[PDB]
From a paper:
To study proteasomes derived from the dormant state, we ruptured spores via bead-beating, in the absence of ATP, and performed size exclusion chromatography on the spore lysate. Using 52,679 particles for 3D refinement, we obtained a 2.8 Å map of the 20S CP. Here, we use cryo-electron microscopy (cryo-EM) to study the 20S proteasomes isolated from dormant microsporidian spores and identify a pair of PI31-like (PI31L) proteins symmetrically bound at high occupancy within the 20S central cavity. The identified PI31L of V. necatrix, a small protein of 147 amino acids, fits in the available density. Two PI31L molecules bind with their C-terminal half (residues 76 to 147) symmetrically in the central cavity and occlude all 3 active sites in each ring. The resolved C-terminal portion of the protein starts on β5 and β6 with the two shorter fragments (76-89, 96-107), connected through a disordered linker of 6 amino acids. A short flexible linker connects these shorter fragments to the continuous density corresponding to amino acids 113-147, located on the opposite β-ring. There, PI31L blocks the active sites of β2 and β1 and buries its C-terminal end in binding sites on β7. In the β5 pocket, PI31L bulges out and loops back in on itself, resulting in Phe101, Ile100, Ala99, Asp84, and Leu85 representing P3, P2, P1, P1', and P2', respectively. However, PI31L appears to evade digestion via structural constraints caused by Pro129 in the P4 site, which serve to push the P1 site Asp132 out of the active site and into a region where the angle is suboptimal for nucleophilic attack by the active site threonine.
Proteasomes, proteolytic complexes expressed in all known eukaryotes, play a key role in this process by degrading undesirable and misfolded proteins. While the RP is responsible for substrate recognition, deubiquitination, unfolding, and translocation, the CP houses the proteolytic active sites that hydrolyze targeted proteins. Similar to typical eukaryotes, microsporidian proteasomes are composed of 28 proteins in a C2-symmetric α1–7β1–7/β1–7α1–7 arrangement. The 20S structure described in this work is the most minimized eukaryotic proteasome studied to date and reveals that microsporidia have deleted many of the insertions that differentiate individual α and β subunits.
Numbering used by the authors:
A (entry chain A): 1 to 225
B (entry chain F): 2 to 235
C (entry chain E): 6 to 230
D (entry chain C): 6 to 224
E (entry chain B): 2 to 229
F (entry chain H): 7 to 224
G (entry chain G), H (entry chain D): 2 to 234
I (entry chain N): 22 to 215
Amino acid sequence: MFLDTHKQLTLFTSEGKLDQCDNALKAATQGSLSVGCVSENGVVLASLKESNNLVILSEYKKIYQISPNLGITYSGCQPDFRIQYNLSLKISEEYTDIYSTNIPIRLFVEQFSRQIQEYTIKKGYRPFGTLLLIVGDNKMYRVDPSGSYTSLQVGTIGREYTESGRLLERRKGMLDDNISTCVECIREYCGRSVKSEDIDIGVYRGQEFRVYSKEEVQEVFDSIN
Amino acid sequence: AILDVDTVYTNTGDILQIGYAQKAADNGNTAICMKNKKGLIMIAEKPIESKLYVSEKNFRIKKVNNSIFQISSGIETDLVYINENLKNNLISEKHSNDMDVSHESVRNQIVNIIHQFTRYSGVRPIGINLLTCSKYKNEYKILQTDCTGKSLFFKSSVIGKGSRIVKTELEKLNLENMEIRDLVENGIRILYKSYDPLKDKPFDIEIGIMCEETNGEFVRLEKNQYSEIIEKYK
Amino acid sequence: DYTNYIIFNPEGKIKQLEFINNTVQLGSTVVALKNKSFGVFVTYNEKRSKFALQQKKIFPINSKSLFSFSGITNDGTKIVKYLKNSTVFENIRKGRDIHPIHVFDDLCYSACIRTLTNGNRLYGVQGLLLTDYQGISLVLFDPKGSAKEVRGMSIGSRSQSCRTILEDECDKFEEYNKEELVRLGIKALRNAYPETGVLNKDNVDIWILETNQESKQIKSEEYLQ
Amino acid sequence: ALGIFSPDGRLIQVEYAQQASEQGSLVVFSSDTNEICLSIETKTHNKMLIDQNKLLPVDKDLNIWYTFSGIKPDSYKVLNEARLICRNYKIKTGTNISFDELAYELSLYKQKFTLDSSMRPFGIRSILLQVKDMAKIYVLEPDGNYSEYKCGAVGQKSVSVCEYLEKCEEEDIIFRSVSGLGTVVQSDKNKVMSYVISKDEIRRVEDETVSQIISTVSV
Amino acid sequence: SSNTFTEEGRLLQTEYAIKNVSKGGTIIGLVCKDGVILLGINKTELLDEREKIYKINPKVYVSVSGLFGDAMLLKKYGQVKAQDFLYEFDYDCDIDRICNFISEKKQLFTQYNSTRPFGFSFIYAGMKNNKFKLCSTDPSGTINEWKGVCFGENEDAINNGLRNDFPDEEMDMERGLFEIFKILSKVTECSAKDHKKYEILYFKNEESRFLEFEEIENILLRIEEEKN
Amino acid sequence: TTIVGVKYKGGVVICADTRSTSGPIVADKNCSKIHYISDNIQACGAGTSADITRVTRKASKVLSIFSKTYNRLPRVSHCVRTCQLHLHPYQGHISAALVVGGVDDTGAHLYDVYPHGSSNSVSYTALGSGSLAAISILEAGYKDMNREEAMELACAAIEAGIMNDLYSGSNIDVCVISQEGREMFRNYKKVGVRNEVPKFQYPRSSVKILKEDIYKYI
Amino acid sequence: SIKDEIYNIFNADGKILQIEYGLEAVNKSLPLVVLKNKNMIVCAAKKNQGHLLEDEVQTSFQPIYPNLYSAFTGNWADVFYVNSKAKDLAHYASYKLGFSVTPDILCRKLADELQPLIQSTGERAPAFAGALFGFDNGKPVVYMTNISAVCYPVYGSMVGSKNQNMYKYVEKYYNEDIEDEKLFEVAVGGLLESLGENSVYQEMEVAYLRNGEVLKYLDDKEIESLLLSIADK
Amino acid sequence: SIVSRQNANTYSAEGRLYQVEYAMQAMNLGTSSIGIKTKDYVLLASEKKIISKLQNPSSVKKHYRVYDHIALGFSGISADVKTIVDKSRNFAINHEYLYDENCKVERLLEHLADLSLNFDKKEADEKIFSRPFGASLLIIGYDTEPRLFSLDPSGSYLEYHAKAIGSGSEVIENMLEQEFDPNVDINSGLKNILNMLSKVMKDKINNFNVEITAITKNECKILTPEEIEQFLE
Amino acid sequence: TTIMAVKYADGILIGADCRTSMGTYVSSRFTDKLTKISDNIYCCRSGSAADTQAITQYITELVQRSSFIDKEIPSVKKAAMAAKDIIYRYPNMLAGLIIAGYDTKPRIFNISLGGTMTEAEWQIGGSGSAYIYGLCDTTFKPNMNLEEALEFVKLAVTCAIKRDNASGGCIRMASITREGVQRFFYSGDKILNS
């Protein structure tokens, strides 16, 4: 029979697992590595950019800003992240309309995760194939295709996530040095020598989140070398 | 397992259902359209399935508007939907601008209406080759559309089963400075050259011309105009 | 795989559109003969049981217009109502009679929609419209969404024998008189129904339409008994 | 297949819902002109589990009571619609809904989920019960069928209980109901409750008598 | 599969959803003389925020086991419905109303063919008629009242312990938690070995509070010493 | 009010008076009439105070989503178009008139937006009750200017409206958006100086308390 | 198995098989190259079938909106469909934006409209690949998008048959500060790495874009000279 | 959903719709009933489906009053028949509303036949179900003549002088072709119909397992058990 | 307002004043009334300021849309028709437009308040047009050169400015030809001093 648009593509298996949600998690796990490191002075967020296809690395961005205090990065398929980013911008702007303040990390993550989970119950729809790291308000949240979120101190998404996560535990420290520490940590998980073009860095300091410019990332690497 | 259950890609990238639709379309009755500076004509086979049908009053050529008419081969009832929607869109477009619909706008409408059948799931590919002849700014163009929606403009084109034989004869043909009656003569001759009596039934000819002698209005020739040519080439 | 729903089989044909041809052959025979001046409907009606009343297969759409069909009777009744409504609309809102072929334009569009998409049901009825419009015109409507003018036609069970009997004499319809056309229709029925006694004064109803004159049912006594 | 016929002319999902409505705790009842006795059995394997009351009122002034067998969560929705039907009917019409009208509308609600795709039959045998002018009990099938019962049983192994009730034509409906329930349940495994519905009043029977009468059946 | 019956007369999708719950973190509940204990076992140290036990309204708390996304979705739904009830009648609803909201939505999702059941279970702590109550809701939407119940990993073992190892004696929630830890340790040593993954709520209708792991260790030393 | 806008070679100057009024009664002093829309765009409005904030907030949202999504600082034309598409459907019932100014990749732009949804690119602007008093100064003193001369012409324009318009007064807020970024001068001037009135104190015995209930935050 | 083959869902490998199959369909289409330097954008592609009865000039580069072009390959019908959809989106977004939409905005809009066809079942995802390009406030910008609904800012895109060989050549030789004629040579050489360096000029078309003017096509003799220069060195 | 609607509307290679073929099997899986038409009266007798004797005989009624002078008997799935009855009552009352008269029975049959095969239509009042109704109906009434109509799940209907539906339909028809004569009085007609019914009833015929409706020019009578007692002997 | 459009030997010449007013107050005296629809089509707006702007914003994208669907230069006829539908479909929108351009030949289309569309060789509009109907009637000459037509527009709009209070300021002019659009400027210094 032709495609049943009303079909429920996410269901429990006889083992109690959601068949399609695990496949979406697998799809997200294959994405480019991205990490975050919490510190007593702030939070760092870094990700790697693929240089293939003649992509303009200076213009292509992997870490995105949702609000002045929130940042986000992903591992998985880009289109799903772009749709989720539109959704997150809508969420934050709605909160700012109502309350006039920057959306707190936890409320944002909750409202965002519920709408992510919407697709694990939506007929004829598959879950987003992306893992998300959200950095803000001196905290970090990893959000998975299931719509389940967890606050983290050191987190990794994409390839080499478990072993990198263990390495991040060995590579924590003061925020000012934590940037270089975590850049060293993730230098162990890149297929080629990393230039400053190949990495995005976003750091939450004080009351705002800002993504380093390509020139700043050179400064961080000058400390590395 | 072949994934032809629906309009979806196979592992090699091919959409099998569109291939089946093209198989259906390529087995229809032939229609030949030839375009020239002096006018445009279209010939259409009308096989005599039974003598009970009044072939002289059953028309294969369907008009979209006063300046656009089209003919199809294959499952020709799909042309009913295609023509109805094209007419609804293009009459409104013409009269909302008080000017003729251009060839490119007609092509846009054709492609966009034919593609949705090759694009959705609970839908069946259009399964016809379609020739759409139109006049715009005192120019004539023939638009041959496939089952995929791919439609290109041609100087002369043919659809239907006998297309393979007719196309070579057209390639042998020079259209510049041919009179419209020369086009009628050549079209009938080429149509009969692809008859292949042992496989196809005898057919009547439907001819529609669009030339200066009729100020570009579509005119369906009556049999007495080309009975002599049919007698010559029977 | 390809039998159940609307899709091309690998050979390039839709099996459901062939099945509707078997569907339209279920009903009892209707035999139609047309001459420029007048036309004839001849029908065979068999009581479904000893205690069942005849179903009156022929329906008059308007004075000087007759319709009849074979197949699913619900679709036939729908078409009868459609033709009556179209007659009213054309007489009032357009100041003219229904065009024998173009009166079926909306119905053909609907049938084409049904043949192009699943979910919608294909019409399982084949109709004959005999109407006076610049003379007597006879039209055959097919469930695939096409209405074509004919010199004479037979629809219903065992209609091919009637069709061939009519076709062997089609070129002479323009010369036959009304009695001759009725005789040829009864001959076609006889060829389809050579079993004696089955065709009788009760089972056959003959309808006569003459140009510029009302349509009338005439007794079958003079032609079968 | 859902909301459609099978090749042999069977509404497969409707009969599956019937079966699911049979796999439920057994309910037994019997009625006379002025009273109904309603008895329910429950599984006591869990001491920490608090057994819910299965006899719920549909409308307290009309004295209509509701009971069910089968999928418990569906019973919540069906009872909610019974109460809503009573209340909406009083709003729209200004007069109390009659028992038969309530049964008809609840049966229509039941049938609604069997006429459509994308939705699943309730699969509960629901019992409507009233004592205002006379005893009246309606048993509503998951497919929308409904008819009055003088006495009967529904749920797990209820066919045998109905077969026994056919013979157990005793005048005391308490005797009839409790004995019919006793044909199946085990006193050690099943805790049993019994209620007598009277004119605009309700009360449950003593455990001692019900247990004593139950002990004499299926010995 | 989807939400449809079978020859056996059972909704296999709902059964699989219920099976999913037993893989979640352990959550326990117990009604006592002076309150209700709500206990949950996380998979990691989680002092940052409560994750197994939540609040619906001033007098209803819920424990969570199973699919976290669905659990938080319906937790937010229940909170919104409790606030809607307060908006309507200008007072907070009891445990029964929250149970009804969540059970109605769960049943809707196990009855709609084009959707899947919610793979989580709740335990509701609350009061009614001036007496403490402890409800539960399965993925099917059934509402069960309990004196004590457990869900998640070791659900069957802890439930059996409550069935036949928990004293029938009415006790204040201090001894209630002590006995819960007793039976939990008897079932598995990991319960008495570690305590930083525990969330424990002392639900009192007006003055509910959460226990610090120092208090949990104060219970731990008592249980360690009572057997010596 | 006298919200004013002046366009100079490399930026815009948007000035306003810090006063709000409801009838003959002054409602709010030191009111900030310059609303944030973007780092390179500011809007100052006159009319229904709630409509100015919400219309300028809608533009701020749409321009913030645009810049965040496309990593591209918004154009003033985008802000005006968003406001026009919002104000026009309401037929002016949402009574908001704005002076939107900013600097884009195309240079400095200053627009006048009216309640019915019309817009007008302009070189200098005045709006509110004091517009006529302000526009008189702008007419006489406007020319091709730098930011320094544009600053004083706009402030002189506001000063004229404050002094001559009944419903304008208090301070002057100034905000300059140049190619180098926006810079603000809240209460840039205090032309409406008040007198140094002493304090007045009642005896605490002058008020009697009937009953008292004390509640504690927890 | 057939469950994952047909529906737009993740298989056990973590990929949507239908998108991969559409990508294969695109890869089987004609080769096309769009490549830009600091001052101009160069696009070259294989000309479509040379029918003798043809009465049209068939180019793979289509103007979508003022100062905004597209160069797509794949199924002809799908390429046409996405071109018309891009024109629709361009006119709507130009209405909403108060200014003529630029290539980046249109690529983002088009990909965000294509994504639902990737996440949901019922509509087939168009099999196309190529770059929406143009001049944004004086700077040449090229954005690549395809059936998978991705959108990247790229120096250029090499799509169609043997796109990997074209990429290997172009990346090896291409640079941003490359000169205009060297850009022509690099783009056409990347194309020839798919077509074959011995292909005659009649087999492919070349066009270039400059800030203040419309897209321009190289003449037949110009392409002859360009191919002779490329074969020379 | 499109797939379910297609499953409803799929035709068989032999002709008739598959769903109609299955509904025609379901239509006679019920208790038997006979309808007799005479130029003075129309009768309709049916044996009650008393599953258990605890189910009171009164509440298992099988004849529904469609209007002032229309009664409806049925066989097959009884759940569908209450919906059919409700829509028939709505049609009759609407006809009186428009025309202030009792509708012809043939007009009600036409309305129901039109509504039968409208599974796809999205408005409830313009269809019966999403599938054929699994019941066969004998609709009797008086419209200046006693009328007996049979409506099948296929949507077809026929006016009959006599018909039997249910599991005993074929036997009762083979008996009707010998025993039935319309020149007979109403009381003797009731005797004959009850005699024919008793042949197929599972248990002995009595006035409590039988329901009889007799519609005449004077009254639309439903016979009480104390009246059926007169004819059982 | 005083908007003017004259078709001359080799293109279109449109003239307009600069004054925009509310009541006795001139809200702005540099308003541009020659609204560009495309590089070859210009619209002279008259009527409600907000409504005419709304239409010309929509006509701008509609004429570009069809231009690229058709693959030819934008059609001033299509822009005028697109304006007529909006002005007709929405009576609440008080709008009257002169749409003049050059696609293949110069064309002037006048859309009145109710959507009445007429093609004209010369057209005037606005409040100040009432005072130059006699001047334009007597002074218009078919097939003027650019200088002759520029004088004609200059004379007509000047005499409307001197009489209509809602019309004032310098005369903006724009000549659309096949070669492009060239803007002109007749300063009010000359007009007022005379």
